[PDB]
Amino acid sequence: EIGVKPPRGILLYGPPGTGKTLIARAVANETGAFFFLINGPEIMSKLAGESESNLRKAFEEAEKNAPAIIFIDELDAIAPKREKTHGEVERRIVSQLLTLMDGLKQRAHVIVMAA
Amino acid sequence: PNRLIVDEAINEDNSVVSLSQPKMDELQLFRGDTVLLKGKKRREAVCIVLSDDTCSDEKIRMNRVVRNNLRVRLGDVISIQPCPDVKYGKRIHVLPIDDTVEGITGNLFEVYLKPYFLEAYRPIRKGDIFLVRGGMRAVEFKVVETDPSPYCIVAPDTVIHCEGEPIKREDEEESLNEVGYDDIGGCRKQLAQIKEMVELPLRHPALFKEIGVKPPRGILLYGPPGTGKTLIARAVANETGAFFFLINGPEIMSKLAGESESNLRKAFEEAEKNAPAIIFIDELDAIAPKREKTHGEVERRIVSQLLTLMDGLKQRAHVIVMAATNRPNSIDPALRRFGRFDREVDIGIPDATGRLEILQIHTKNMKLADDVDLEQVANETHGHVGADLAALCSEAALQAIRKKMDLIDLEDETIDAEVMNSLAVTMDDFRWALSQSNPSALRETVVEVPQVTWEDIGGLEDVKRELQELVQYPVEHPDKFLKFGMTPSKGVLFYGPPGCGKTLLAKAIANECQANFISIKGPELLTMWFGESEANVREIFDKARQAAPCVLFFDQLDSIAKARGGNIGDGGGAADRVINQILTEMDGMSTKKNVFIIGATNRPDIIDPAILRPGRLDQLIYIPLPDEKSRVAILKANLRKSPVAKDVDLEFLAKMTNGFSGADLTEICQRACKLAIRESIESEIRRERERQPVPEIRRDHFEEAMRFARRSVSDNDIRKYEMFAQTLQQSRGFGSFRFPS
Ligand SMILES: Nc1ncnc2c1ncn2[C@@H]1O[C@H](COP(=O)(O)OP(=O)(O)OP(=O)(O)O)[C@@H](O)[C@H]1O
Ligand SMILES: Nc1ncnc2c1ncn2[C@@H]1O[C@H](COP(=O)(O)OP(=O)(O)O)[C@@H](O)[C@H]1O
Ligand SMILES: Nc1ncnc2c1ncn2[C@@H]1O[C@H](COP(=O)(O)OP(=O)(O)O)[C@@H](O)[C@H]1O
Ligand SMILES: [Mg+2]
């Protein structure tokens, strides 16, 4: 009705153990729209190149099964500060995540949540 | 004459234009001919030209479909030219829009294309979108192949096939939402320069060949973050139809030896492969610092690679390399050479009209009420940058949303249409968003607003007028000073006994006046380091110079400014060296920007006279102890909000309070009200005690109040301030200036 931009990026931050994963599971159990969860350790465990494919496939499936709830638990694993980082694979994953974040055209009805 | 104002059609379908017959004679265009139209972002249209008796000479009548094709709206300007040599079509490929054929399972060809193309000889182009009625819902099509290309006349023999993959709504929405020259506000002159460097050689290279010069291939953009450098780059790249390649400084940088060089080489290889291209290197400052300044060899290696790449790039390629930086002085001077971004284009903080344009751009899609006024928001956002303005609009939308949550039920999926239509952006929403938004030009100098207004300040009417005039006359009336050919005054110093309103007169300007306010505590700028204390002075003035018109306020200026050379204990001359840095900033060899310097000092005699000369702090205003009339105004101003008993005679208090300062009167008001708090608290407690009053402060509260009050400034102290103001009078040409005869 008002033609505005919904906030696609939601960032939950705080001391650990507070229940961000608890909120993640609560959202997953109780959202009618499609849900798919990705973890920082899970992405980093995968070899070079396949993590690229995993992230792209996850986002593609999310926008395919619209609406979608994209959750990245332990985001700092996959997006360490570019000012202080060494791994080029991590740099490329940061660039890929940035591009995919900018990719949404808002007709995908896909929300991205970070803990 | 070719340029035409876009006008509404009356009976015209997708392939006819209705124009004035006199212009048909002027342009030598005959009825029934096929005509070529070009619009914004490189869109071409072929139409059968017709004449109309009701069309204005400068206007062209067209329907919605072609305007949507031509990406032009009513009031825009389009080009009209003959389109000869258009042959009949052999085989044309059409493809429908995905959202127009949802649920349609009929034969697209027979139902839609045949009635539309039956014996009509409609001209078409590759990429055209035309709307055809019929069936159960009007169907749009996208023309993807034309034989011949890109123009053909659809003859009856033209084999028309519509099979294939329907076009997604993604490309259609991108075409409308692709950035362009319209999405830029507040940078018209810089945009014109960039047009001259980029668009003109592409449009008319014949002029450059005639004069035999090669236009520069590099444009350097510098300004505060978010001012629109990347947006300008993308807009100029999209309008020229050049492949926009974006490079960020951090992601090029790598720990491995030579990897950043390889990244730059590969990027330039991709740009030279995909031509025309416009390389954009954001954060150029971090990637390419000064080779002699840096000690890490990788930075100098990156700079040398960039030099060799941009030098070998100029092989008559169609690639233009532009970069954005916050501070151009950090960039290596080897880059500033001929070529290698040989021209620098400056993007600044948006002005009032510029930010008004930016708000109009960012609210064109948004629904707005009739109560909301855009010029108001343009005024109130004093130092906001365009990105901040877009965030402001979004935050106001979410403001309306959080207002209207309580009406809508999140549980049910059903939506009410009237509740939906009620939703619109209101002025209150912009006010909230502005209250919870920051100016990025001043985000570093952030401070709370104590909310002081000119009506709050009691007395000082002559001094109040001068502050209004000095801050307002240049910015509000710039042509008037040009008419008289003299620059305005930009310096004020307040000296007086403590508590008389020196800080109030500055806290009023921070709110009322529409000028940026950067606030400085006295010893704030000083640093224990050798070269930082003077550097802090430089950066604070640079911040104020950037966000002009700005009011720079030096509270307790006596600490910063001393008569110089007083003693060797001043940090080994560091204190006296800070003076010299301030002296050049106020009055040095730089163009006088709209930076108004105000200083509030208690003791002015210690101030360096080089500060107090005209041109730095030219107007010295003495704020005395309030007089009988002034003390009345202070009392009324303080008790304006508080409920006061009618039997209180505020004029009587001012008569007995002979020498009390301004803060002394405010203490009495606070003390008088403080006792009234004590009385109401006890009476309320007594009511609780008995079970198991004073709506306005009475005159009885005042009588016990004054006996606690006292005079902050002694008689001897006033004499010192009184002595100083007398010297200024003695310095002037004696006697009231009387012109002879
Ligand atoms: N003319 C006045 N009208 C109204 N209130 C005043 C006036 N003068 C002083 N006050 C009151 O004095 C208090 C603070 O005074 P203020 O900060 O303006 O003093 P100042 O002259 O700048 O002193 P200092 O030299 O100590 O910094 C406030 O409560 C303010 O309302
Ligand atoms: N209010 C709560 N109710 C139930 N469980 C909680 C609550 N707060 C925390 N937890 C528990 O703490 C864990 C949350 O850890 P979390 O902070 O998500 O780890 P990390 O932040 O390191 O990923 C969950 O397993 C959850 O069971
Ligand atoms: N002159 C302008 N007109 C319209 N929008 C602008 C303008 N300047 C900046 N913006 C907004 O700022 C955002 C982009 O910020 P940008 O200027 O690209 O960052 P930076 O210059 O720091 O790289 C865009 O959303 C754009 O709408
Ligand atoms: Mg003060």
Side-chain angles (χ1 to χ4, degrees), chain B residues 364-366 368-378:
Chain B
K364 69 183 178 182
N365 284 47
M366 281 205 98
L368 284 180
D370 293 359
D371 290 358
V372 59
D373 184 28
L374 280 172
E375 188 187 5
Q376 203 54 250
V377 176

Side-chain angles (χ1 to χ4, degrees), chain B residues 461-476:
Chain B
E461 50 206 80
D462 53 307
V463 186
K464 275 193 302 179
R465 188 172 181 176
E466 278 288 348
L467 287 179
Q468 313 214 320
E469 287 178 4
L470 187 153
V471 174
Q472 213 164 20
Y473 281 0
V475 58
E476 182 66 27

Side-chain angles (χ1 to χ4, degrees), chain B residues 456-460 497-504 556 602 634 637-638 662-663 666:
Chain B
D456 191 359
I457 288 154
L460 294 174
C500 295
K502 288 183 290 304
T503 311
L504 276 177
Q556 304 301 339
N602 263 346
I634 296 174
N638 284 186
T666 295

Side-chain angles (χ1 to χ4, degrees), chain A residues 12-35:
Chain A
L12 301 193
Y13 73 96
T18 48
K20 296 172 297 295
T21 311
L22 173 83
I23 291 179
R25 271 99 168 98
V27 168
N29 272 264
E30 303 204 28
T31 48
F34 173 81
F35 186 100

Side-chain angles (χ1 to χ4, degrees), chain A residues 2-7 82-83 85-86 88 91 95 98 103 105-107, chain B residues 98 169-170 173 250-251 253-255 365-366 394 397-398 401 420 423:
Chain A
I2 48 174
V4 66
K5 183 69 180 294
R82 289 220 287 260
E83 182 75 12
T85 185
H86 299 111
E88 171 61 22
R91 173 132 300 161
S95 290
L98 183 63
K105 296 203 171 181
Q106 267 285 350
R107 44 159 288 188
Chain B
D98 58 354
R169 175 51 160 300
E170 184 178 1
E173 66 164 342
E251 42 175 339
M253 177 70 207
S254 299
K255 206 204 180 152
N365 284 47
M366 281 205 98
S394 305
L398 275 72
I401 299 301
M420 181 75 97
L423 183 63

Side-chain angles (χ1 to χ4, degrees), chain B residues 40-59:
Chain B
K40 181 92 176 294
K41 309 184 195 68
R42 190 69 195 63
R43 295 307 188 274
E44 281 215 80
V46 292
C47 293
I48 303 308
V49 62
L50 297 187
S51 75
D52 188 5
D53 55 357
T54 59
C55 192
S56 307
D57 299 335
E58 80 287 352
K59 296 185 193 158

Side-chain angles (χ1 to χ4, degrees), chain B residues 625-645:
Chain B
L625 281 179
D627 268 9
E628 286 257 352
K629 174 82 181 83
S630 298
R631 289 194 300 272
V632 172
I634 296 174
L635 282 193
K636 279 157 187 302
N638 284 186
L639 310 192
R640 185 180 67 189
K641 295 303 280 272
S642 299
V644 65

